[PDB]
């Protein structure tokens, strides 16, 4: 599955902009429907999940995998989540939204070290060069559409994941401790 | 008799073999005496790695290589080392 | 207790007996004996179908059946949902689940499985009542 | 199965052969025993040369084991030297 539903009501429920712009929260910064600790932990998990757009089962396992690394569990968990290719595409600015960036990847417009990767959840590593394929160099949505851990070149339409983010670069709305708490139940 | 043969590991449409020394009556993927190396015919070129000291130990005990194992030993130059040892 | 007293006569864990003990037998025709096999449902034949009065302070007519299971045990089951098609000699499927307010009723009949029909005009929680999705 | 049937026929026919050899070795062995019971050496000592024949005959044809013979020989030869 993926969530294909309305993007705004998620922002409105969580009380953050998931797009990062603010626009879901311009007119009605309150919960969807006529009524606009476990909660707060859950809210925070759903914050971070809905932002990056992954399903719980894959999210809980991406957290289990980040635990094995050395350092803060929450910190390293945000770092991998950021490495996901759909996100890296979206951060390099090849796409306007994460949902566009997904579809870019999923339909196979993207290259990673010259070779086709059609997997949003691909976990991009430092050194690896994100690019557009030659059939899709003149996509409208790409022409239409950057942090320091990345590097881009809008002439060639190819970026690079030069380093791992470090956490100050990542979404500061997120209290990752809460999510580490969420899972410790 | 003791044989040197390939044990099938790997997964459904991607075989990988370990070269094991084994009594003949043992089941293919079951009981074995010693592992001697590994053959990955799927990769291009087929990746082969053999630990000579054992291979020769077991040729000279008179474990007989199966047809493919024989040919794997040939290409690493074991069969030569075995033949030259019986003379010199 | 002292260590030496434990060495001599150890700790004894309790027994935790089944909430649903008619599910936890089988029956071997050829040997004529009970098996000790846990099962997640059972089949059985309704020998009686009626209504019971719940224990106070509850009040209703609670729809039950008296079922003889494949393993030859005879058990009262509750019939959930609004309105049912069970008569004597219906072949039913029982699951685990005591009904709190009915003394003697440790099993629920499964709706929609074997001769037990689904609940009619149910539209939320359908799966719990054996009812197919109305439109198309 | 074909090969079972053939084996059954052969197994019966190798068996009857084998009893011929066992019997003829039990003959040779018992002769020594009665000879040493009579306290006659010449008979006993010649019967032991024959018993050895019939005993090791069987060891040739698998029907006695190296070891099971070497027992039988020793046992009998101890009686012949016990004269």
């Amino acid at each position: 599955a993926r969530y294909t539903g309305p993007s705004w009501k998620l922002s409105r429920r969580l009380g953050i902009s998931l797009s990062g712009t603010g626009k879901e929260l311009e007119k009605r910064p309150y919960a969807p429907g006529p009524h606009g600790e476990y909660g707060l932990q859950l809210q925070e998990k759903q914050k971070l999940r809905h932002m990056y757009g992954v399903n719980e089962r894959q999210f809980r396992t991406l957290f289990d995998k980040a635990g094995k690394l050395a350092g803060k569990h929450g910190e390293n968990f945000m770092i991998l989540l950021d490495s996901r290719l759909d996100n890296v595409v979206y951060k390099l600015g090849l796409a306007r939204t994460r949902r566009q960036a997904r579809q870019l990847v999923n339909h196979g417009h993207i290259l990673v070290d010259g070779s086709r990767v059609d997997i949003p959840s691909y976990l991009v590593k430092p050194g690896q060069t994100i690019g557009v394929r030659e059939k899709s160099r003149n996509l409208s949505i790409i022409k239409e559409s950057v942090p320091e851990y990345l590097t881009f070149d809008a002439e060639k339409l190819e970026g690079t994941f030069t380093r791992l983010p470090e956490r100050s670069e990542l979404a500061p709305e997120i209290n990752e401790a809460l999510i580490v708490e969420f899972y410790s139940r | 008799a003791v044989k040197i043969r390939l044990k099938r590991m790997g997964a459904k449409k991607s075989p990988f073999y370990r070269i094991v020394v084994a009594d003949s009556r043992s089941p293919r993927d079951g009981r074995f005496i010693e592992t001697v190396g590994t053959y990955n015919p799927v990769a291009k070129p087929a990746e082969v790695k053999i630990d000579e000291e054992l291979a020769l130990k077991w040729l000279q005990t008179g474990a007989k290589p199966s047809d493919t194992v024989r040919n794997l030993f040939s290409s690493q130059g074991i069969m030569e080392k075995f033949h030259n040892a019986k003379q010199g | 207790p002292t260590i030496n007293q434990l060495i001599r006569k150890g700790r004894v864990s309790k027994v935790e007996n089944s909430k649903s003990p008619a599910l936890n037998k089988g029956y071997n025709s050829f040997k004529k004996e009970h098996t000790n096999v846990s099962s997640p449902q059972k089949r059985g034949v309704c020998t009686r179908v009626g209504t019971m009065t719940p224990k106070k302070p509850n009040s209703a007519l609670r729809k039950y059946a008296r079922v003889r299971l494949t393993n030859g045990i005879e058990v009262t089951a509750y019939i959930p949902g609004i309105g049912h098609n069970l008569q004597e000699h219906s072949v039913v499927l029982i699951r685990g689940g005591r009904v709190k307010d009915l003394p003697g009723v440790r099993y629920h009949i499964v709706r929609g499985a074997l001769d037990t029909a689904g609940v009619e005009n149910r539209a939320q929680g359908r799966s719990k009542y054996g009812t197919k999705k109305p439109k198309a | 199965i074909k090969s079972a049937i053939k084996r059954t026929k052969t197994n019966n026919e190798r068996r009857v052969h084998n009893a011929t050899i066992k019997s003829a070795m039990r003959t040779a062995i018992k002769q020594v025993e009665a000879s040493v019971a009579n306290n006659e050496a010449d008979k006993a000592k010649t019967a032991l040369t024959e018993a050895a024949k019939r005993i090791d005959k069987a060891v040739k044809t698998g029907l006695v084991h190296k070891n099971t013979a070497a027992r039988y020989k020793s046992r009998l030869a101890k009686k012949v030297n016990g004269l």
């Binding site: - | - | 260590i3 030496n4 434990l6 060495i7 150890g10 | -």
Partner: protein, 84 residues
């Protein structure tokens, strides 16, 4: 190379009533798995003694052998301390 060694056990005799056969006992401390206190365990052994040297009470050495009967798998080696 040298021979491999049979097991040796120093024990106490607890019968001599059988002909050529002593019943030695060996007392060792097995830990309890759960608790961790060491507990006295006794293992009787029948051993073969050809000259009936060892008597009830004696602290004897024994060595393992091939089976010498249904139960005897040991021979008397020495009588380290005699009875009182």
């Amino acid at each position: 190379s040298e021979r491999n060694q049979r097991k040796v056990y120093q024990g106490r005799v607890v019968s001599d009533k059988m002909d050529k056969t002593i019943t030695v006992v060996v007392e060792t401390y097995k830990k309890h798995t759960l608790y961790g206190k060491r507990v006295k365990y006794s293992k009787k052994f029948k051993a073969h003694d050809e000259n009936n040297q060892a008597k009830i009470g004696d602290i004897v050495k024994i060595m393992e052998t091939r089976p010498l009967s249904a139960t005897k798998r040991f021979r008397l080696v020495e009588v380290v301390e005699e009875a009182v």
